[PDB]
């Protein structure tokens, strides 16, 4: 059954009606299919915005139960070399229709991983077979796509999911499976999602697993932070205040206590402090330059692995030195 599947797959939209946050694109595609004027599509966007789900739902709507033999889907997991493009795709696009269901769709998922030769060969396949064949190209990085392929496909940008769409989908998930989510917990979940629905679903599943009895227990912000392990906003505010106001010893003690009470990671703390500082009042540009450069260098050092205490002291010193420029 579907109950065994992870929520990221159990709650995969089955129809375009369940797709949220892409209203303009959804309406444009509805009009295209209704008027029978669907052009070559290029869905460009970051991970987990609903490109694969949207195209699958569109294919279901156009055909219905024939989606198996009306659509050819190729992704990175499959071989997509020049030879594959020259034989399999060419054969699929050069054959007549089973039931004259409009056209044949080719979903080149994760096409940004295709080789340049494959794209060059595929451009003329796209151009030659367009009377009864359609192409959809899904990508997260456009610079990996050849300029000609970009020009020959109508581009649709999948923006990060707005807050309202994610709230609606969370409400639908809660209704489907008995569970309660506090407004503060929902706000924290939205903040940590950063416009990714996969993160939303994974965190919700893990938070339900965190709750002892998922029948009468309500998800709270504390549960969300404990499950995700990310710092709470209060900890970030306190550590920033200590760094910007307290002495070196006090700041070191505060940071150590904050990151040892819950075993927090320094990368998350630095990201939170950066986000907080990005919306502060600065009277000098050199302060911002110092903050940005030093913090970016510290994150780069952290990415490679080093001494945790050294990096924490580096963050504290960089912040203190940069903020000394003011006044």
């Amino acid at each position: 059954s579907k109950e065994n599947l992870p929520w990221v797959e159990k709650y995969r939209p089955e129809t375009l009606d369940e797709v949220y946050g892409q209203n303009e694109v959804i309406t444009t595609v509805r009009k295209f299919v209704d008027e029978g004027k669907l052009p070559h599509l290029l869905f460009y966007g970051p991970p987990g915005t609903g490109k694969t789900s949207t195209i699958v739902a569109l294919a279901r709507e156009i055909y219905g139960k024939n989606y198996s033999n009306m659509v050819l889907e190729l992704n990175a997991s499959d071989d997509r070399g020049i030879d594959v493009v020259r034989n399999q795709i060419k054969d699929f696009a050069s054959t007549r229709q089973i039931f004259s269901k409009g056209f044949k769709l080719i979903i080149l998922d994760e096409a940004d991983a295709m080789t340049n030769a494959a794209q060059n060969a595929l451009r003329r396949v796209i151009e030659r077979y367009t009377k009864n064949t359609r192409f959809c190209v899904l990508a997260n990085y456009a610079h990996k796509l050849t300029p000609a392929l970009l020009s020959r496909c109508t581009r649709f940008r999948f923006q990060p999911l707005p807050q309202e769409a994610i709230e609606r989908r969370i409400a639908n998930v809660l209704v489907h499976e008995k569970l309660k989510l506090s407004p503060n917990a929902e706000k924290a979940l939205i903040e940590l999602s950063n416009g990714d629905m996969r993160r939303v679903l994974n965190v919700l599943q893990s938070c339900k697993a965190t709750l002892d009895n998922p029948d009468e227990d309500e998800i709270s912000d504390d549960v969300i932070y404990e499950c995700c392990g990310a710092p709470r906003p209060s900890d970030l505010k306190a550590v920033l205040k200590s760094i910007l106001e307290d002495d070196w010893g006090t700041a070191h003690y505060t940071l150590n206590k904050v990151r040892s009470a819950k075993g927090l990671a320094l990368i998350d703390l630095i990201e939170g402090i950066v986000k907080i500082l990005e919306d502060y009042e600065l009277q000098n540009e050199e302060t911002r330059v110092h903050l940005l450069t030093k913090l970016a260098d510290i994150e780069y050092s952290i990415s490679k692995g080093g001494n945790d205490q050294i990096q924490g002291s580096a963050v504290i010193g960089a912040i203190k030195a940069s903020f000394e420029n003011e006044t």
């Binding site: 024939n66 198996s68 033999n69 007549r96 089973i98 004259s100």
Partner: protein
């Protein structure tokens, strides 16, 4: 392995509207397919025609590096038995209309081995263009 979501039964012939139907001996068809394979056939044309005074024409036209070659089966009953070109309806048989089906030889050559052991071959073309071989 997990059964592919793709339905292998999606490709079928509609019996209501059959463009034409033919009966041929397995040996002759196997020989013709071998001949096309030898010349490195790239594209195949199935040509079917029925005319008056018991005139039946079934031909394979190969487009390859040789250019265009033609292999036509005879009208003898022992090889080519019985032909209709319905024009789409499976009820009325007309004379003078030619049914032409264009195929990639890569797919067409996948039945040669099946035809080698064949004792009889039934060909059917519908209006939709799907070729069925029994």
């Amino acid at each position: 392995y997990l059964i592919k979501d793709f339905d292998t039964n999606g490709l079928e012939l509609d019996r209501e509207r059959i463009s034409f139907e033919a009966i041929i001996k397995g040996e002759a068809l196997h020989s013709a397919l071998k001949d096309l394979k030898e010349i490195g056939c790239k594209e195949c044309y199935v040509y079917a025609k029925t005319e008056a005074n018991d005139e039946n024409v079934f031909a394979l036209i190969s487009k390859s590096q040789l250019g265009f070659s033609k292999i036509k089966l005879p009208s003898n009953r022992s090889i080519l038995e019985k032909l209709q070109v319905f024009d789409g309806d499976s009820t009325t048989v007309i004379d003078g209309f030619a049914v032409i089906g264009f195929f990639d030889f890569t797919s067409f050559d996948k039945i040669r081995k099946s035809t080698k052991i064949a004792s009889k071959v039934l060909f059917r073309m519908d209006v939709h263009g799907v070729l069925s071989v029994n």
